[PDB]
Design an enzyme around this catalytic site. Structure first.
Site, PDB file in Angstrom:
ATOM      1  N   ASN A 151      65.877  44.049 -21.599  1.00  0.00           N
ATOM      2  CA  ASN A 151      66.858  45.068 -21.189  1.00  0.00           C
ATOM      3  C   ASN A 151      67.124  45.079 -19.669  1.00  0.00           C
ATOM      4  O   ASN A 151      67.741  46.014 -19.169  1.00  0.00           O
ATOM      5  CB  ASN A 151      66.457  46.477 -21.661  1.00  0.00           C
TER       6      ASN A 151
ATOM      7  N   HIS B 234      65.015  45.408 -17.171  1.00  0.00           N
ATOM      8  CA  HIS B 234      64.147  46.297 -16.396  1.00  0.00           C
ATOM      9  C   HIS B 234      62.885  45.511 -16.009  1.00  0.00           C
ATOM     10  O   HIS B 234      62.538  44.548 -16.699  1.00  0.00           O
ATOM     11  CB  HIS B 234      63.745  47.528 -17.227  1.00  0.00           C
TER      12      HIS B 234
ATOM     13  N   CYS C 149      60.829  50.118 -10.404  1.00  0.00           N
ATOM     14  CA  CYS C 149      61.273  49.300  -9.277  1.00  0.00           C
ATOM     15  C   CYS C 149      62.595  48.742  -9.845  1.00  0.00           C
ATOM     16  O   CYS C 149      62.594  48.084 -10.897  1.00  0.00           O
ATOM     17  CB  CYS C 149      60.294  48.178  -8.940  1.00  0.00           C
TER      18      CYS C 149
END
Ligand SMILES: CS(=O)(=O)Cc1nc2ccccc2[nH]1
Ligand SMILES: CS(=O)(=O)Cc1nc2ccccc2[nH]1
Lengths: 266, 267
Positions: free
Chosen positions: A188, A190, A225
């Site tokens: 995804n 991330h 992050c």
């Protein structure tokens, strides 16, 4: 991999790969963390969920499960070529969220070589707001979890539930300017939660790594992050060898993670 | 995994993991590269070698096998949960060194979904000096390789043997300040060869990655990035298809570590 007889837990075996081991020729804690994540995704698949393990109702509300805390305790790291067997199960902890536990075993002897626990919360994927677990969502998961408490860490007031304090400047050791690359992202886009463990460990001196073995790691997840962000990893000895860790954005110093590690002399 | 009936090649199956896939939910080229490396390591183990695949005679002389070039061509990336089967074999190319080849297949249909080739040289691990494969060392490996030529890339003038030129400044795209972390190291504390592929791909824009699929990647290995080195990744478009010229160099003096090319097809 497969759900056990009662369908309330999932088991899978893994053969340790050559690129998965460190200088001791035994699996790294990041490989262990990736294998825990893998058996967790396979347990979700085996029962109809989904790496957010969502129901159709949570997908409609834009709700996802996010890790709040990961705690891993390793007694013996599996060597290159060894088969490790991992059992995992979930359990609700009220409206707070869900706990996923793991037990790691040597497939040959059957002895427990490690154990892990994790705390998860429900979050709106867009607003990033915690909306806490509702009854109609809770009920959808209850049929895949045991009713009697089944804990990987049963001892009262154990290391997995200790409160972690904020590291104070100046840090003893630091690793500055850490950035994720494409291999650090998940499906995804991330940053994978295992990358943060790697970033925490980057500030441990090579002398500690070469003379000690990591026994316990506890990590709190506060903020993600966001790919084009830069991370500073801070470490201070608090002692076996114990360390307090802090991950913060290189710029303003916004906290992303706080953790502790315990290391044993070789 | 297991050696085939004739003992001249090795086969292994892998189930694609959730952390091994990209945004398309199919295995990344770095996962493919790690799986090629794994089946290569298991072929060496199955026949007595020990990731330098050395004989006791090479260990005595402090000689290792090092990659000079890697070439990967993917037709279909295996999806998450799919089983991929990989066959691998080695073949000597005279005193120059040896070639390891791979064939990737879909375990369900049996169709070839990809193929790879690599060129390896013998190097003294202390002085880093190259030397031609001696006849006594060459003979130790000949009994584990086929005698008839068996090529993953048989084509007249195939992409795997094309000469790669040096990128000229200014680069079109760049990714500066790349450093390896502990997870990028192997069991001997050297940067894993798959990390360099990742570093090359870091300078490809996200628009290309999102709209295209990587079809071919060819990478030359010139110099190692040491633990404390910093890398700059440079890319310039050289082109239905999109082609790029790549350069990896040390952030400071600009010493070359890798040069490569990629070919991408529209989704
Ligand atoms: C926070 S969680 O662990 O991702 C939610 C969950 N609970 C489960 C119960 C059974 C199978 C998969 C399950 N996923
Ligand atoms: C440069 S190489 O290809 O890693 C050397 C080699 N050649 C082999 C032949 C059979 C088995 C393992 C082998 N390792």
């Amino acid at each position: 991999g497969s759900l056990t007889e009662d369908g309330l837990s999932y088991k899978e075996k893994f053969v340790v790969r050559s690129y998965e081991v460190g200088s001791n020729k035994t699996a790294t804690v990041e490989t262990i963390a990736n294998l825990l994540q893998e058996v967790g995704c396979n347990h979700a698949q085996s029962v109809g969920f989904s790496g957010f393990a969502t129901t159709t109702t949570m997908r409609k509300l834009h709700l996802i499960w996010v890790t709040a805390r990961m705690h891993i305790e390793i007694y013996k790291y599996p060597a290159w070529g060894d088969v490790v067997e991992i059992e995992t199960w979930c359990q609700s902890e009220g409206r707070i969220g869900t706990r996923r536990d793991w037990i790691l075993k040597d497939s040959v002897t059957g002895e427990v070589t490690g154990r892990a626990t994790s705390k998860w919360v429900m979050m709106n994927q867009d607003t990033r707001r915690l909306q806490k677990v509702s009854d109609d969502v809770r009920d959808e998961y209850l049929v895949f979890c045991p009713q009697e408490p089944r804990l990987a860490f049963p001892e009262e007031n154990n290391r997995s539930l200790k409160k972690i304090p904020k590291l104070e400047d100046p840090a003893q050791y630091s690793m500055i300017g850490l950035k994720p690359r494409r291999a650090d992202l998940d499906m995804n886009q991330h940053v994978n939660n295992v990358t943060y463990i790697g970033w925490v460990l980057e500030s441990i001196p090579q002398e500690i790594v070469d003379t000690h073995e990591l026994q316990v790691i506890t990590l709190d997840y506060r903020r993600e992050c966001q790919q084009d962000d830069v991370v500073d990893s801070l470490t201070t000895t608090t002692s076996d060898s114990q360390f307090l860790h802090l991950l913060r954005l290189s710029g303003d110093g916004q906290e992303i993670n706080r953790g502790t590690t315990l290391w044993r002399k070789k």
